[model samples]
Target: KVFGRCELAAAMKRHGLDNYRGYSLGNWVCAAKFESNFNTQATNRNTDGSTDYGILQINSRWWCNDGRTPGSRNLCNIPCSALLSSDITASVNCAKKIVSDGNGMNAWVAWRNRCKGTDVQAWIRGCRL
Candidate 1:
């Protein structure tokens, strides 16, 4: 499902994702826009035969079990399907877990390729907050 940009931003703030781990809210919002464009059900197949799932485009190789990918790490102990939903609490938890594992948004390639070193405000350009 796709969310309005302001809806997406407000959800992130409500989830306490605004200031999680010292990264700016703009970074997370920007990354999400680049990663999946606020589509909760988004999924993309990778060249390595893995899938990037959900709004954050989290990889199946390590985070969760999509079943299509064998030998998943399942570090987040969730079904990949859980990340692909309107209820984003699980997705938010898993993303925060990922960020905690490294040096900030380095875990999200979309963040590095798009959000990083760019105008983060671009992600929330038309949002009220």
Candidate 2:
């Protein structure tokens, strides 16, 4: 699913993304926009041989097990395939774990480069959440 702007915001908000790890919902929404354009099926392979999956682009290096990344932590205790589902439950949960793990939003380069220190309010501007 390619989530609409507000749709993504509402979903993330429903999952307690607002103020999660002191980061606003818009920050996550902005990260999704740059990371995968809110496309649930999005996937990318890094040069280091790890892979990113789903809307938040959860990485196989530490979060999910893809049976390919060396020393995979599988911290989320699920397969990377699960992140591609449009339901987003696992995606949001895994993201929460990422932030809660002390990585902060900087775990994602897109968030650091595009959303960090920026007025991400625009990402959720029209959303009622």
Candidate 3:
């Protein structure tokens, strides 16, 4: 959805490396393309029957503080909850800050690994912080 893409782009622009451009954006697009196909309303089933919901595939039980109500604004306020909120860019921005805080890009890398299996370098290059 356009809203989802706009949210994602805003998130990326906020935390992405100042030198990010071209292939970086392309890589980001690729990650989102492979992850949820840019679907902000997407959801998936986990092995334990727990649900992964929303654009970033946030686990509802663990991530959503306000449950899965549409238009809920605080869905992603907690750690790892960014995927469930109406403003996905905020979620991405949170992830970016975490990645920038000397976490070695592990979390973002893990997400990209799950979403995009064959583009680790591209994922890193596209990611800011």
Candidate 4:
């Protein structure tokens, strides 16, 4: 499922992402946009034999148990399929864990490259947050 900017903004905030880990909602929104284009089913295989899954592209190497990663931590204790749901609840929770582990949003390469140092507030502009 692909979400509109405002739709995703509301969904993410409703799920408790506002100001999570000192990062604004826009930072998440920005990461989601760049990482997966807001598509819940997006998946990308890495050269390292792991895969990225779902909206924030939670990684097989550390988060979900995809059964194919060489040695996944499965820190989220969920199947990688959970991340592909359109509901996004599983993805949201997994991302929260990712940040809480002290990785911050830098767990995602796309976030680091695109959103880390940017003023992401504009990503939520025109939305009634």
Candidate 5:
């Protein structure tokens, strides 16, 4: 099942995504909204033939191994399928590492398109911390 807006806010908070490492909580939530509509099982094949996995859409190119994909750096040392788990602890950790890589949430194109400059608090509303 897809994570409801309230559930995702709670999960993101529980997992330490709120203002994580200087980036606002809004970025993570916005990216998740556009990338997977908060569905944990979300996966998509890129034109580059690599798969982006999970709510964060982590790519096989540098994060996880999908086995069938070529040129995976697998920096997360995890199977891409792991990101699809409803228990998103692993995916959240991987997302943190990705953000720490100096790009912040810019790695997620959805953030650039939808989350940047918007009043991301609108996403959390009554669920705010």
Candidate 6:
């Protein structure tokens, strides 16, 4: 059962986050919001004026400097060109890897545990995950 334009949900699923529930989404949303405001093409500049790019804020020159393709542009300080080609899921997964080694939700684990959180099963049962 699809529901609305859940780009976040789709991204989570692509990153094997279908099993996330309760504060998992909260944690992810919180971090993403803080990092990029949920913008898939977000970018920023460092103190050195280097560009950062994408939803997960992947720095092409730092993480993806294989060749000087269009994906390697220094615009916005963050290289989000790959995001245009990458799917929501891949982007989320990449974020997880780069940010937390797939433990992006760990920062809020204590909070989630204190709330007696449920797993993805809860979401499937009532979309409350």
All models: lDDT?
Answer: 0.84, 0.93, 0.49, 0.93, 0.85, 0.46
Cα-lDDT of candidate 2 = 0.93
Please give, for residues 1-129, the per-residue lDDT of candidate 6 as tens digits: 112224555455556655343335434543444455567666665554344555545555534432443345432233345653435644554554444433335433332343234333332333332
Local distance difference test, candidate 5: 0.85
Of models 1 and 5, which has the larger lDDT?
5
- Model 4: per-residue Cα lDDT at residue 90: 95
Candidate 1: lDDT of 27? 87
lDDT of 2 by residue, 5-58 (tens): 899999999999988888888999999999999999999999887999999999
Q: C-alpha displacement of 75 in model 3, angstroms?
A: 13
TM-score of each: 0.88, 0.96, 0.47, 0.96, 0.93, 0.48
Tens digits of per-residue lDDT, candidate 1, 40-112, equal 9999998776899899899998898888776689888899889898878878889888877775798889899
Off by over 4 Å in 6: 1-6, 18-23, 66-80, 84-86, 99-129
Q: For each candidate in turn, give its C-alpha RMSD to the true structure in angstroms.
A: 1.8, 0.9, 7.3, 0.9, 1.3, 8.0
Cα deviation at 118, candidate 5, in Å, is: 0.7
Clashing pairs in 2: none
Model 4 per-residue lDDT at 13: 96
lDDT of 6 at 71: 40
